[PDB]
A paper describes a structure:
TRPV5 is a calcium selective channel that displays constitutive activity in the presence of basal levels of the membrane phospholipid phosphatidylinositol 4,5-bisphosphate (PI(4,5)P2). The TRPV5 channel is tetrameric and consists of classic TRPV family features, including six transmembrane helices (S1–S6), N-terminal ankyrin repeats (ARD), and the TRP domain4. Two endogenous mechanisms of regulation, binding of PI(4,5)P2 or CaM to TRPV5, result in activation or inactivation of the channel, respectively. Here we have presented three structures of TRPV5, one in the presence of endogenous lipids that are likely to be involved in maintaining the structure of TRPV5, one bound to its endogenous activator, PI(4,5)P2, and one bound to its endogenous inhibitor, CaM.
In order to investigate the mechanism of TRPV5 inactivation by CaM, we incubated detergent solubilized full-length rabbit TRPV5 with calcium-activated rat CaM in a 1:20 molar ratio in the presence of 10 mM CaCl2. The stoichiometry of TRPV5 to CaM has been speculated to be between one and four molecules of CaM per tetramer and the affinity between CaM and the TRPV5 C-terminus estimated at ~0.3 µM24, therefore the high molar ratio was used to ensure TRPV5 saturation with CaM. This sample yielded a cryo-EM map at 4.4 Å without applied symmetry. In this structure, a single CaM molecule is bound to the intracellular section of TRPV5 at the base of the pore. CaM is bound with the C-lobe at the base of the pore and the N-lobe resting against the ankyrin repeats of two adjacent TRPV5 monomers. An extension of the TRPV5 chain A C-terminus (Asn640-Lys652) forms a helix and is bound to the hydrophobic binding pocket of the CaM N-lobe. This interaction is mediated by numerous hydrophobic contacts: Val644, Leu645, Val648, and Phe651 on the TRPV5 side and Phe20, Leu33, Val36, and Leu64 on the CaM side. A loop of the CaM C-lobe (Gly114-Thr118) crosses over the bottom of the TRPV5 pore, placing Lys116 directly into the pore. The ε-amino group of Lys116 sits in between the four Trp583 residues of the lower gate, forming a cation–π interaction and thereby blocking the flow of ions through the pore. On the other hand, the Trp583 to Leu mutant of TRPV5 was essentially not inhibited by Ca2+-CaM. Despite the interaction with CaM, the CaM-bound conformation of TRPV5 is almost identical to the lipid-bound conformation of TRPV5, with an RMSD of ~0.6 A overall and a very similar pore profile.
Author numbering:
A (entry chain A): 201 to 225, 230 to 332
B (entry chain A): 599 to 652, 699 to 709
C (entry chain C): 29 to 225, 230 to 638
D (entry chain D): 29 to 225, 230 to 639
E (entry chain E): 6 to 40, 65 to 77, 83 to 147
The structure:
Amino acid sequence: HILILQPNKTFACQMYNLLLSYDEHQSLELVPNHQGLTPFKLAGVEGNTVMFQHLMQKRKHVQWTCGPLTSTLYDLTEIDSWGEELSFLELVVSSKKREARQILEQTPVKELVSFKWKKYGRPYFCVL
Amino acid sequence: ATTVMLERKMPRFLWPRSGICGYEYGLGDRWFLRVENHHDQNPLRVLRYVEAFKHRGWEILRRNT
Amino acid sequence: WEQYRDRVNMLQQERIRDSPLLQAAKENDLRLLKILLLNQSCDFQQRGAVGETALHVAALYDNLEAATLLMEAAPELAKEPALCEPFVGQTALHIAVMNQNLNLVRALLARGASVSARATGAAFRRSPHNLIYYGEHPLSFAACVGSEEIVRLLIEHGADIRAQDSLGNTVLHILILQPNKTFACQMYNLLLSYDEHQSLELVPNHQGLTPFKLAGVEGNTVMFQHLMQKRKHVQWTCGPLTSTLYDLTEIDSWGEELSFLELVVSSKKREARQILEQTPVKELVSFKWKKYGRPYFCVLASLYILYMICFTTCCIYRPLKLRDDNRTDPRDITILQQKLLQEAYVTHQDNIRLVGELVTVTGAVIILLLEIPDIFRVGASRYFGQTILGGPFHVIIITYASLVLLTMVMRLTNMNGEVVPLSFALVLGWCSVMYFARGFQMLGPFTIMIQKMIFGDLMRFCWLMAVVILGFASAFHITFQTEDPNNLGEFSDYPTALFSTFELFLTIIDGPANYSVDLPFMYCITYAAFAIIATLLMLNLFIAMMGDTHWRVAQERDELWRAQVVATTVMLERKMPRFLWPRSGICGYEYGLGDRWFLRVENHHD
Amino acid sequence: WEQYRDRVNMLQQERIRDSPLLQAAKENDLRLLKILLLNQSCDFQQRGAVGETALHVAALYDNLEAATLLMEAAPELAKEPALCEPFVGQTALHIAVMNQNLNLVRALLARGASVSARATGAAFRRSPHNLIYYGEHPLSFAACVGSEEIVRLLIEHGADIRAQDSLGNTVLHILILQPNKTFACQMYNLLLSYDEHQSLELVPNHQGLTPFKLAGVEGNTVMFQHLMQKRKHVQWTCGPLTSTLYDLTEIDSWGEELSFLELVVSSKKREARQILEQTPVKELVSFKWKKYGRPYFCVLASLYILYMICFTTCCIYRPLKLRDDNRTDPRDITILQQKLLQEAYVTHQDNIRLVGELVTVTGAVIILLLEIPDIFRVGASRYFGQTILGGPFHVIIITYASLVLLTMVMRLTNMNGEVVPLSFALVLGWCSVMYFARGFQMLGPFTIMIQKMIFGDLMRFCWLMAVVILGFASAFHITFQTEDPNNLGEFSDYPTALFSTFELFLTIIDGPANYSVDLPFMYCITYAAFAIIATLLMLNLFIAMMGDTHWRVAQERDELWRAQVVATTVMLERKMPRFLWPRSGICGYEYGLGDRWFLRVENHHDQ
Amino acid sequence: TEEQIAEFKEAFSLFDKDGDGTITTKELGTVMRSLDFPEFLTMMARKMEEEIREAFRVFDKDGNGYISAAELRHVMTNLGEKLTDEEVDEMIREADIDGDGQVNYEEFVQMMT
Ligand SMILES: [Ca+2]
Ligand SMILES: [Ca+2]
Ligand SMILES: [Ca+2]
């Protein structure tokens, strides 16, 4: 949590991945604070997008390369939190800090919410 | 924000939850998103690293420094 | 669609997860692969369950050693394309060409996999769904990947340069349809050198488009001028300067039906307006407009103005009569009446009015007889959207001609209410002149600026205007529905009230008050609220946003107008007869060159 | 013309293609050239159809060994000029100069061709048809191409520097008339050193232009300051600073009618307008304006202000008369009447207004007498050209003076309609103040922005206006003809409806309405459509286009207004009597320097 | 240093095809035909002003070591001089040598000097 709360450094992110390597073991990442915040959600509401995509690095899985183009898949498990009451996305968009609006432009989430809009939200909004 | 508001408040009957049911594909209870990209192949970024492996605003920006 | 594509891709990954033969193939676990090859009962005809083969898998994962171990037991799979639905003609040759592994390609040719095997899958298609289009035959893949030695080897082992595709494409076409590289120019010159010889450049596509015309419509201008360099002929240098000449033979195509120039200027792609800035066509259109086009356009517009004023004075002296009946009614003033047609045609003044009307209708019919067969040639939706061609100016004039045709029919049936379509067609014919306002230099870009602007943000002002006045007009009609209309005015019923608010929003009419009589308590507050929210608030925002938009498009509109004038030029040279249009060029048959027109040009170098 | 050049070039190239001797010449077919030279019977004096030497062809294509074989065979072809219409005196000498083959030039001079031959063809002309002009001489061509050793060899073999072409081109003049090269300064210095002698710079052209005046009217300010470097004279340096002095004798143009500085400001080129920024001239015009120009301008402005008021109060008291007849008619108001002449002048007040009119007319006639002889001296189309001069300002004061001269005769003839020229002359003569705005510092560039803008985009708005407003006026007259005109107003007939649309277009008059009586059903839609296209749409677009062009233009007017004041200054000091204008300069004849006027100037700077 | 290792971070990601965190010879082999990260950081370490470093740090808003056009436009609007958006892209075309739509410290310092 305090590695998140920092002027953002890949220099610090090496220490982050280092301490994650020194995690020698339940999952340590699943800890909330007194406010109930996982460091995933803390980084999301903080929007340190370098730290966010480094957090996203192990979330990837590639599938195949094909000359100049390459397919992959993401795990959208922790990004949804539909089972929770506090969704990740509303937690992002409801914030006092400004630059959290930048984390909307991440390569997992952008096309996802755009697709979910253009299939669903625009006809319902127009008919309403 | 408008989207996630209406998608919180409207009932679930109109909406299958998005994602890819990997349990159908034996991945099991975790939903995914496949995406691809075509990139360019700039040689110059590769050349030096593999080799190691072997005008108005510009003036004022100089004045601001 | 795309969802179907990703679903069947994930199912393909399931099927590659299924069989341990293919799984050990993509893993390259050659110790276990020796066990599988030692197994007789391991069937080697087992293909990928969704339409692929094991050699395709080894070609994907580049496990060439495993591929060599596969090729002894089943070399016939090297010659086999598989039966997937988007991937129906695909062979491992295409993947090996793509991944640039010359030893793998050489081993495939060692088994003798046929180069002439062509691959036309559903994903192998020019599509917005498809991200990359690379052509059909493996030569196209070798060209777009740019491997020199591979396509050299293909030449050595077959692979005819004359290659005909679905949509009639050739290697030249897919070289044109390409994100531009200077390396593509080298590949182009290479295969042009390896061409033996009619000439291969002469062939069009299935649509009937030569690669010269394809390069013209696509505007890869480096490739364009580089292709022009072969036709460039220099004559002599002296001192600082150099006289050269060009063969303008293929650039005119006056003998053809569809010229190069009308092809280029009629395109949905934007960057083609840049390609007219190349030197020989620039000099050509400059010479051609400067010699003839501007006086013809001036005299045509002059005769149109002379038609319009005669139409106007025809519209002045309509035959009228005193109103016969009595009104029996205050708030009723209607003192005039139409004449009958037998009543009208009575005087010498009526005779000259009638011959002026005859002039108007015989000028009306020729507009239809001019432009109606032009509409069937091109797509009408393509015809109206092109602001460079003046499609919206064509929108007005056909309605003008229709209404002026209709009003005479309304007259001949003794039908009333012709004043309304006359009032329509009058102002439409007067606003018709802005098409002909193009021709001046000072006048040109201004009207296409305002034509951009009226489509630009006028609706953004208009919709908000409608809803806010729909609020306040109803508020005013409620707050004035109790008292004497003889003193208040404008708010008798709702339809005059909304029009009153429309008049008084724009500040055209002064605010309503009588200071003799008394006034209700709320209207002060409501009217002041309307005044602050409407008059100065966002009217000024319209000014500011207008200024920013003009500030941004101030660069682009001149670039548009330069294309607009030569579009006008090629239009008028299409429709005018040819004795008014002599041949622009240099008949080299006079000079023994023979049946070709050239253009000499010079300058000193910089 | 330009088209004819294409035909003659291609026909010449065809005749190049025709002669196989010329084919082997242009292609250096030296085996076949020895074969053709083995033929005695071959004519070797073959010339092209436009008239050319085979040596000219070989010099064009630099086949110099074939040229040596030809001069060995026939040297007499080397001394032949071209007989072309565009090329009436062209030799291989000019070609070998411009293509710079020094050994070939040495071979040409080895045969001894005359350097002083004159190639004065039609394409050798300062023309927009011609690309780059240089003049005639081979010396000029060696100078403009900048080869030292060629023109050194020319000096070694005669080739006198003192020469002249058509229009008085001398070598220094055409060196000035060049695009900027660093080598031009060096070659200028070289030929200046090689001049050995009145001086050679003293000669003007046929037009009467010394090369210093040519550099002034062109404004090649690097060449100007390098020429001025000789005119500089340092006096002393000490510490970080340096006092020096300049000779302003050359910059004066004292005894001439053709003054230098007015010749500078009377130019079409903008870049010569830059040359005011040089160090002697800026100090001189600043000193001369500051000591004399501003108060002399202000006193004359005050006098003209006082002159306008007498004409004003003269125009106030016209002789009037009660109307004799009876109009007997509604829409007829003619209650006053013009007064007769002999009826008028009877009081002391009549004498007052009479002498007040006499002041105006005697001012007007001397305005004419001052204005007229300026026109014949200068180009009249030029006189109305430059806004620095204020030509269109001069037009309206000419017309004002003309009308106020004219209006006396209608009184002298007792002609009716006396107000008709008078009101026009009044409103035009009040606009005669805008020239004086350039005298004030804060007021100067503002009115030239206005004068730029009224020619700039006002016509773009005006030509768009008339069509749309005419169509709507026609629609309004053929929607209000059905109705009683007393109750509607503004639309009785066609001219008043046409004018009424112009009235309420620019919101001068509130929109027409009636409460007691109803309206035509069609009128609402028409007027609403006119309102939405009219007010907020295109007027506001004119505002935005005004604002966009304001920022883009707004820089240059400052330099332009600073350019205006010195033309104002020289025109002011030129026409005044001489005792009000003393001699600027420093009379060093008192000081043993002798009859020359200098200017001391110093500058602290960094080292 | 931190922008320097930001260059090697995306470089190592360009070498790492499967994204496993290593560079194998097969990943190296696919590079040659087109012609760990602390292992890569150590290997490139032997191969390798204050105000400029201070200038870049206030410029790069997110601290990714790469200034975008929108970051530049936000600085250009913070400068106070009006410019349209096309010439801002030309400014990227002026500085981006290898063509990534980005500028590093090294493309920045060659522009300033
Ligand atoms: Ca790896
Ligand atoms: Ca950034
Ligand atoms: Ca870069």
